[PDB]
Design a protein around this ligand. Structure first.
Ligand SMILES: *[C@H](C)[C@H]1/C(=C/c2[nH]c(/C=C3N=C(/C=C4\NC(=O)C(CC)=C4C)C(C)=C\3CCC(=O)O)c(CCC(=O)O)c2C)NC(=O)[C@@H]1C
Ligand SMILES: *[C@H](C)[C@H]1/C(=C/c2[nH]c(/C=C3N=C(/C=C4\NC(=O)C(CC)=C4C)C(C)=C\3CCC(=O)O)c(CCC(=O)O)c2C)NC(=O)[C@@H]1C
Ligand SMILES: *[C@H](C)[C@H]1/C(=C/c2[nH]c(/C=C3N=C(/C=C4\NC(=O)C(CC)=C4C)C(C)=C\3CCC(=O)O)c(CCC(=O)O)c2C)NC(=O)[C@@H]1C
Ligand SMILES: *[C@H](C)[C@H]1/C(=C/c2[nH]c(/C=C3N=C(/C=C4\NC(=O)C(CC)=C4C)C(C)=C\3CCC(=O)O)c(CCC(=O)O)c2C)NC(=O)[C@@H]1C
Ligand SMILES: *[C@H](C)[C@H]1/C(=C/c2[nH]c(/C=C3N=C(/C=C4\NC(=O)C(CC)=C4C)C(C)=C\3CCC(=O)O)c(CCC(=O)O)c2C)NC(=O)[C@@H]1C
Ligand SMILES: *[C@H](C)[C@H]1/C(=C/c2[nH]c(/C=C3N=C(/C=C4\NC(=O)C(CC)=C4C)C(C)=C\3CCC(=O)O)c(CCC(=O)O)c2C)NC(=O)[C@@H]1C
Lengths: 161, 50, 49, 160, 66, 169, 160, 160, 161, 160, 161, 161, 160
């Protein structure tokens, strides 16, 4: 649970040094991008359900995954899958606000692959859906903030894979 | 967290065991928790061979 | 009742070979920065295209 | 930081960050330039702040430097001044972050336990941080000192 | 808004030695949000609260009541 | 890898029991039906290629989406590997019909199959349907050949389908 | 208000108001004039915003006014426009407050349950409020409209 | 199945299946032949049931087939008809099982979440199943139709 | 807990098709065996205490296990052992009624070896006592049910070993 | 078993079972009835076989049961007879199976290790099994006894 | 492993459509920068050793990391650390040539957090070093190649984080 | 592996300090214990098979472990168990010679608990068996080095637990 | 150490320590006191050894300390002296261990890689350690100097 500001100061703290000028430059960078990050976060908040719905339609619906015997087929499984996509999008938004994928590490990816492998969830199909969510999010929040959201979606994909 | 906490504390099992007057207490352990406690030298005693 | 085998990690087999990937693949597996000649071969393709 | 406290509350309530919390983050990122400037002055003058405030601490509380006090002798006094330096470093961190949680995480949680173990008197340490606040206020402008003083005030309040 | 009510909860007959006086007569403070659960518990006990009052002065504000 | 005889022996050995009359009765049942099992496996072995081809065509007509560009069998590279999986199932199922026990299927085919299919991206539901289509074709062929009890030939395919499928309770 | 929410939250922890929360209420005090100005201009255009945004809602979703839609008949169309007006009234309250505590209590908690009982489609309500957000943004000053859009975003996000 | 529902509720209390539950299973297995016949008839007439019921649903609730609804165009309308086929199939499974357990686990758990995240009116889905119930009454004998109507009623009960 | 009927309908559901005539044949078969299964369950339920009493007497009583230091010595441990024998009987009866070993796999045998090895319970003796229960049960319910109760009891023994 | 040996070899080939292999296991299941009879004679007469083999062991090798020997004692000699019983049970398993691999799996893989640990003369164990073979051959016909001897003699050879 | 051409072709192939004009534009951009990519790659190959030398000197050297017990103290550890920086540079060069980050995900980032967390390697210090390598490399190869190589260095940095 | 010498020098190396006089006292103590340790190692080396024989007799044999279905039943498994007990004896003697339990931690304990739980090995019986080995070894090598062997035997017990 | 070397080799051979290896560690424990004395004198005179040997290194190769050399300037030349101090410390570790094992781990692995990338001339480093060896020889008795000479020699050989 480190944001960019906390990460900068934490590294300084471990070294035992007052904030250096280079660290000030890194903090300035976070403050500089803050406005676009906050704006995109509010946009995702408003369109949260739609982002997930579009991603499911773009990557998962009318496919082997949702047709009978595909592990998203039963209604309980469909509800579970969209719940997980909601979880991914919410923590990606938190990560964009903070500037750090550490929240994704601690709250999503610390045991996710083992749970998915045990349950039988197809990792590749989830990765496809998360990638589609990246495309939809980029359109909704704008390309400039879309690059920022993209890195955190990629973090989820790298950990999940 | 607040919703999950109230779900656990409102559950029928919290009222059935621990009631509404009792501090919660460890009621069960997984077998590899009993492995850690009860199979160290000094706690194994005779447990395992006649 | 069918217990699993290790854990399933997504595996990406190569559908087809191309000159970019092929040159880079062999360089990676021999642990050497793309040799000047092989780099020029990729450059032949890239100046073309 | 403001961003991490907002995320923590939203995370514990399964809530995309509320518009008010987003507004708080917006104001904080804008004031960033002023925040970093205040921190720069404080760290540049850290030697003066610690030295003057340490003199004030010993003057106000002679018992700490009297025989039988925690900071009796040159080495013990040196460690006391180092603790004051630590707390100033924490205050600079807090000013930059815009939240007191970096100060709380580093050095303020369990401070009673740690100092009680060491034998140090907690209210006397609070006197030292209060003296540091006075020196920093002299080194800062009025608008700057009000913001930085609030972080000093949290430190003394938690260590009261 | 927290509602405080005194209920002579009907005897559950769950006491052998032990003690049932504290359960038998109850004066408690209950949040208005949690008062529904308290009423359900009173139904299980079998005894309605003899007296019911609410600490907050006004029962309803359509807006910002909190 | 256990036959019916080896399975009964394994259970009794773990319990330390000489084979009693119940064990002899079940062993006799396997021995009596062994001739029919051999004939059925011979039919499958003789028509192995034809069964695979017919089952594949039936599966793709049932589920066109696989052959379409989205599906996993789209190009001929994957079409060959998919046909090979059909051949795998028929080969091990014929082994299981000879064996009279589904432990062969469990140990060599089904174990790790879901992990492998999830990682490679292979869709499991269509594969279950393909195994079922093989089951019906094979049952027709052995029934034509003269095997009266097709319970021996269908049960291994059914076990593969149940283990490979999810619960959908 | 932000002050009221902050005071209650501090009361739970039995803490005097922390430096960050003091800063937040300080900024609420500072921006009060802009808050009142935003409320006044939106109030001036209160009828216009609701009516034209309602037209936009109907235009985007023809099923709303088609047979089988909840807003069928002139009286039901009036009720739908009234709901848009109710949310605008709450949004102006919330903009003045600086906090979503009014918006939440008055008109958002249990909105799914209330509209489910009525038979109304909450997603259709969401599209209508989105149209209101755009209309209000155009009538409001662009810099001020950025802050108001966040509060409209909260309302539409809660709808589902 | 009725067998597993009896076992599950007895396992919770850690008892051997009580005589009443055993009697229930005895009756269910005896009348299983009748149950299989009922499911056979519905399976045989599945095409007609879906077609007639779909026409009735669209006629009663034209908004769904109008523009701006979930099923606009032959592509979306075909998928809606397939969903009606799904629920007919689940009802057949329910008749054969003798309990609502197959219906519940396969297709009544998370229906609100799935259809809400698909943009589909769940009350309209409920009416579609009601139409299928009427068609099934026509195609079944009176005593059988009452029993199958129970499974249709459970579907609509969870739906709305 | 999947039974025969639930398993059949589930398999048909995975394929997606309505219930087939062949599936109807399998369901008819289970309905045919319903009479013996239900009758045997009633017999087991009434005589459950006697089944366990006879099995304990035949295998476990008056041995080292029931004498000091044998793991059935303490009154606590004796009562726990008879409770475990009741477990195996009850879930074997559930399995017989269902026609499916899924309940045994899911609830009874999962981690049974690990719990017993952690507690110090002799798994060999538990297997022998389950065999004694199998023989007593076979006598009580007759060869028809004893054959099936045999397969489920032996399922437990194979897993427990 | 013959069946598993055929299946294993065919699987390593990655070819369906050969017609010749199928005919081999056709012969195996044809002779199953004779195998079961031979196994049942040994099993039902196990008490006499073990006792007479024990007499021959304890007279051909009197040292092992003499004082100081491995089997000396009322209980030690009982465990030795139990071991002879174990190997007879394995031999019956093998006679049923038609292969010595059940015998070899449960015993004879590490018998040297086990008995060397237990301080036992494995030549003496071998002579005990040879006594079992002699006793069993007379309880079977000459044609049947030759089959039984094969499974009794693989054991002895492995014992060396 | 996928280059940009492989990704574009595969996306078009899944859709079934012939290569669209927008896809042509993406491919054309990659081909157009081909000369720059090859040129920069040769520069990296020649100057790779000094790029690493400068980067280590910039951040890691004369630091707590090289102090005793700092995890680059031992000569073993120092040699391995400079090797890993060589790895990142080499695979960043591969990623630049291909134009897609798949090399990084397939070979560099499918075991990186496991290896580094197991060894105790400080992720923050590695991130600082890789950022320093990005700056040094950008100076040597010029701005256009500094941007391209920079995105792949950033990929490795965020993945490590 | 770290022996006592290597542990002392590595502890000093981590700080960065030359070997202190206190560290010299530690090393001198190890050198003083050297004779008794080497003598005991030779004793165990010649009597290794007897130690395992006696221990398996004292604890493992004539129990439910060796009855059919008890996990040590079957000659394959009895051979395997005596092999594992000799593993423990050999590594424990290595540890007595070296003076540090790092051999046990590196070569025995790490991962053994998981493999044992996977294979079904009773873990209580293993602990009782190696404690029985401790009793036998104390007799053979004498009390003073029996004091020493016990430390490492107990280490193995704790790791398996 | 000798102990670790023996145990590693024997562990790879899965063999209780060979009788000769047991004698070897017996000799090592007897010789340990002499080793500790050698380490004691070298570490007590560590400042002398490093200082005068470093002067010798710079005198022998002034280009190395000249401008443009790696040890150019006060800071860099001090760090070069520190490297000489490091290698003396590692040599003391090796003397106590009785084998190169500690020095061949802490240093001497990838020294070529580290230094060559660092820019330093590794033959010059070898000359510096040679100078330290000469000084140590002066500070040690003849037989003692031979062993310490062996460990220094291993270092210089690895350098070359
Ligand atoms: C029909 C009464 C209403 C309606 C429906 C509609 N449905 C879809 C698409 C899907 N429906 C499902 C539902 C299920 N999956 C299941 O496994 C089960 C139980 C066995 C059910 C009920 C799913 C998974 C999909 C999508 C993926 C798929 O291929 O099945 C749509 C299309 C959604 C879209 O925008 O693409 C629609 C419109 N529409 C109506 O008007 C009715 C009120
Ligand atoms: C959706 C894109 C894919 C998919 C997923 C799917 N997941 C589950 C069930 C679970 N998912 C999780 C995942 C998380 N837990 C977390 O804490 C976090 C981080 C916030 C994540 C991402 C968990 C724990 C479960 C278990 C809950 C349970 O008991 O199921 C399912 C349900 C499986 C089932 O059988 O019910 C599914 C289907 N499925 C797909 O088809 C997509 C490709
Ligand atoms: C005597 C006062 C009454 C009585 C008793 C009776 N008991 C048994 C058999 C057993 N009793 C025990 C009891 C214990 N095991 C324990 O570990 C402890 C605590 C230390 C106790 C009390 C057990 C285990 C048995 C089983 C046999 C065995 O020990 O192996 C019998 C024999 C019953 C039978 O049919 O076998 C009897 C008769 N009988 C009376 O009439 C008195 C009222
Ligand atoms: C001296 C005889 C020669 C020489 C050396 C020189 N070294 C450096 C810098 C470093 N040297 C090290 C060496 C080690 N690190 C280790 O962990 C060990 C084993 C315990 C050794 C030997 C390291 C890490 C550095 C980097 C700085 C640091 O310590 O953090 C320099 C400075 C290089 C520079 O310009 O940056 C020099 C000059 N130089 C000579 O001229 C001699 C021939
Ligand atoms: C340098 C910036 C930091 C650092 C690094 C350090 N790394 C190691 C050891 C390993 N590094 C890897 C990583 C990779 N292996 C690969 O094949 C690739 C490319 C595909 C990478 C990135 C691995 C596998 C190891 C361990 C195996 C090995 O020794 O090579 C060490 C050694 C740790 C040890 O003592 O065992 C170190 C020190 N150290 C730092 O201080 C920097 C912050
Ligand atoms: C008899 C012909 C000879 C002989 C044997 C003897 N054996 C033992 C003890 C044991 N024997 C076994 C053997 C087996 N375990 C197995 O799993 C199998 C295969 C299924 C076999 C054959 C075992 C395990 C033991 C240990 C005790 C136990 O069973 O728990 C003894 C007793 C040894 C002692 O002193 O403890 C003897 C004497 N002795 C002879 O004189 C014959 C030549």
């Amino acid at each position: 649970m480190q944001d960019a500001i906390t990460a900068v100061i934490n590294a300084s703290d471990v070294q035992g040094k007052y904030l250096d000028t280079a660290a000030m430059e890194k903090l300035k960078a976070y403050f500089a991008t803050g406005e676009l990050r906050v704006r995109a976060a509010s946009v995702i908040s408003a369109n949260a359900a739609n982002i997930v719905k579009e991603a499911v339609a773009k990557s998962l619906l009318y496919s082997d995954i949702t047709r009978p015997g595909g592990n998203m087929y039963t209604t309980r499984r469909y509800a579970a899958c969209i719940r997980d996509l909601d979880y991914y999008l919410r923590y990606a938004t938190y990560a964009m606000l903070a500037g750090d994928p550490s929240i994704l590490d601690e709250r999503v990816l610390n045991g996710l692959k083992e749970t998915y492998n045990s349950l039988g969830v197809p990792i590749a199909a989830t990765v496809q859906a998360i990638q589609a969510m990246k495309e939809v999010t980029a359109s909704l929040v704008g390309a400039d903030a879309g690059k920022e959201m993209g890195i955190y979606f990629d973090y989820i994909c790298s950990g999940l894979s | 967290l607040y919703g999950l906490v109230d779900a656990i504390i409102d559950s029928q099992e919290y009222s059935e065991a621990f009631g509404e007057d009792t501090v919660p207490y460890e009621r069960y352990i997984t077998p590899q928790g009993l492995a850690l406690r009860s199979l160290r030298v000094g706690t194994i005693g005779e447990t395992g061979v006649p | 009742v069918v217990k699993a085998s290790g854990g399933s990690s997504v595996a990406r087999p190569q559908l087809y070979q191309t000159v970019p990937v092929s040159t880079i693949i062999q360089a990676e597996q021999q642990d050497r920065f793309l040799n000047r000649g092989e780099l020029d071969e990729l450059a032949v393709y890239l100046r073309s295209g | 930081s403001v961003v991490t406290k907002s995320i923590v509350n939203a995370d514990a309530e399964a809530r995309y960050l509320s518009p008010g919390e987003l507004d708080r983050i917006k104001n904080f990122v804008s004031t960033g330039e002023r925040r970093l400037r205040i921190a720069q002055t404080l760290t540049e003058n850290r030697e003066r702040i610690v030295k003057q405030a340490g003199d004030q601490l010993f003057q106000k509380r002679p018992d700490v430097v009297s025989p039988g006090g925690n900071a009796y002798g040159e080495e013990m006094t040196a460690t006391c001044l180092r603790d004051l330096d630590y707390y100033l470093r924490l205050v600079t961190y807090g000013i930059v972050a815009g939240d007191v949680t970096p100060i709380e995480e580093i050095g303020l949680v369990g401070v009673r336990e740690m100092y009680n173990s060491l034998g140090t008197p907690i209210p006397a340490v609070a006197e030292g941080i209060r003296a540091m606040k006075n020196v920093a206020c002299s080194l800062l402008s009025a608008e700057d000192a009000a913001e930085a003083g609030s972080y000093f005030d949290f430190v003394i309040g938690a260590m009261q | 808004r927290m509602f405080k009510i005194t209920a002579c909860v009907p005897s559950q007959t769950r006491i052998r030695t032990q003690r049932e006086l504290q359960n038998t007569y109850f004066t408690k403070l209950v949040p208005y949000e949690n008062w529904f659960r308290e009423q359900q518990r009173i139904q299980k006990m079998g005894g309605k609260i003899v007296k019911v009052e609410l600490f907050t002065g006004k029962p309803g504000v359509n807006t910002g009541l909190a | 890898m256990r036959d019916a005889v080896t399975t009964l022996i394994k259970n009794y050995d773990s319990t330390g029991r000489y084979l009693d009359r119940d064990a002899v009765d079940r062993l006799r049942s396997y021995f009596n039906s062994g001739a029919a099992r051999v004939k059925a496996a011979a039919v499958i072995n003789a028509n192995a290629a034809a069964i695979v081809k017919e089952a594949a065509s039936a599966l793709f007509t049932e589920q066109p989406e696989l052959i379409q560009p989205g599906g996993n069998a789209y190009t001929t590279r994957r079409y060959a590997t998919c046909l090979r999986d059909m051949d795998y199932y028929l080969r091990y199922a014929s082994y299981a019909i000879v064996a009279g026990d589904v432990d062969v299927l469990n140990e060599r085919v089904l174990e790790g199959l879901r992990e492998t299919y999830n990682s490679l991206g292979v869709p499991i539901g269509p594969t279950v349907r393909g195994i079922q289509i093989m089951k019906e074709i094979v049952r027709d062929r052995v029934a034509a050949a003269g095997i009266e009890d097709t319970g021996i030939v269908e049960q291994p395919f059914d076990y593969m389908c149940r283990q490979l499928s999810e619960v959908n309770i």
